[PDB]
Amino acid sequence: KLHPLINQKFQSPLSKEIFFESYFSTENLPFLADHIVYEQVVVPGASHISLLLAAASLTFAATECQIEDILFPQALAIPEQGVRTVQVVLTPQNNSFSFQVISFDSDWAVHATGKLSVAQSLIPLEEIQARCSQKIDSAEIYQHLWDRQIHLGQSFRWIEQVWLGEGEVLCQMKVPKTILNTTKYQLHPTLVDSCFQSIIALVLDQNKNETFVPFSIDKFTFYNSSDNDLLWCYTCGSKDKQSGEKFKADIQLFDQHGQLVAQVIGFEGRKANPKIL
Amino acid sequence: TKLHPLINQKFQSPLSKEIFFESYFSTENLPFLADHIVYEQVVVPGASHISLLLAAASLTFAATECQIEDILFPQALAIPEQGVRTVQVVLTPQNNSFSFQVISFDDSLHISDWAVHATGKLSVANAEQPLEEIQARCSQKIDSAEIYQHLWDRQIHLGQSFRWIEQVWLGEGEVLCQMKVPKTILNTTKYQLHPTLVDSCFQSIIALVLDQSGNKNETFVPFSIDKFTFYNSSDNDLLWCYTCGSKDKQSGEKFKADIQLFDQHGQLVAQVIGFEGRKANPKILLM
């Protein structure tokens, strides 16, 4: 295990592509039991980004990292005690790396596409607190999802407190007790997912069946992994006016010290029935 | 976490045409390598790559018997003292077969420098069902020490684990060797054919060239093989190798041979059709 998320790296001077191989299993990755959709273990797109960051971390000497044009063709589902083999395939392009995340048990599914690429300022917590002043029970975020069949266990419940504003939200997040070794990660999958959960605070209004599943992300930048048990998420976004079915958002994940940890530009979720995934 | 005593990992992907095997070659990982020394260097014999292609095959095919055809050895693999090289088998699908390349590169610093050590085609063979007759034809006993001495004198220093040949009987342009698992090799059950067993078969051709004139620095080095067929692995400590061939009528720089490797019961273990050796100073394979 080169990384808690990757068993093997493979390259050859006889293929263009660089490969990573992981065995996705609740046995190997306990935390995946905490993200269930209709009784079944469903790996969130967030987990794919974390996997890519780990891939990157094993290819670049650089710590800073940028993921672009992210698309999530198919969901990944791990059957009861089943094992799926997950591969990241990096194809070198000019200036950057193109990628696919795939899995299989000769068919296979494509869970993420986009490019990898090699990616300096402080977020003022006091300024955002002044405009996100409406305190909201963080249980309402989890309750919203639980109602949409998105059952998050405790390791996926980082969001500790929520302050709502006008088309913007602030959350404090704390590493759950169930997860011990976050330092071995760039960004734990559950943390990445928590950042996406932040947009739910913006769509709590009122069909309890359909919900916003991640569709695309224009640019995801990881900067450095915080040693801290305490993080701050800042999220700005709106539902489109025409259909009201796509939510666009910007997310900023930062430090006690205002130091940017990760940021999401151009996040798009779409209203979908969880049953398809 | 070792798939095979010769292979660390296998890699394949729906997004890759070829199938890869990876293996780390060093005297630390593969102690017998220290017993094949050419001009004071650990040099992996072509025989080991045969053994590695059989290892690959046993992980790819269900069927136990397989053939390796039109084998060439473009470049020798030399391992520096206490160093290690990554070795990959790269299989490319063809019609009912794979073309292969065995390659290596120094992993300790993408990949710009690499060498190819064996090429050819790999596929499933059929099974093929006399020893007593050979033993009659081959009656002139010679000391096995003569084979190892011939090699030693050319600076091919074979240690214990490369010395399977115990007894040798010459006939007319043919030789019968009795082989025995060296005491230092406790691992043969994990192998299709141990690399040192394969090398021993090639060594047998030395017995047909013992008193030839010419360059004292020169011997016949394996160059190409039309067909190497592996049938079944042997539980036994004792085997028989029958080899017949001769120098090429046109040029005495090539030696052509067919080799057959038998069980003590006369069951065919392995067969080599059209083995060609070429006269070379073993120094030449160094750099």
From TrEMBL, chain A:
The active site is at H35, D193. Residues 3-120 are annotated as: N-terminal hotdog fold. Residues 3-277 form the PKS/mFAS DH domain. It comes from the Bacteria. Residues 133-277 are annotated as: C-terminal hotdog fold. This is CurJ. It comes from Lyngbya majuscula.
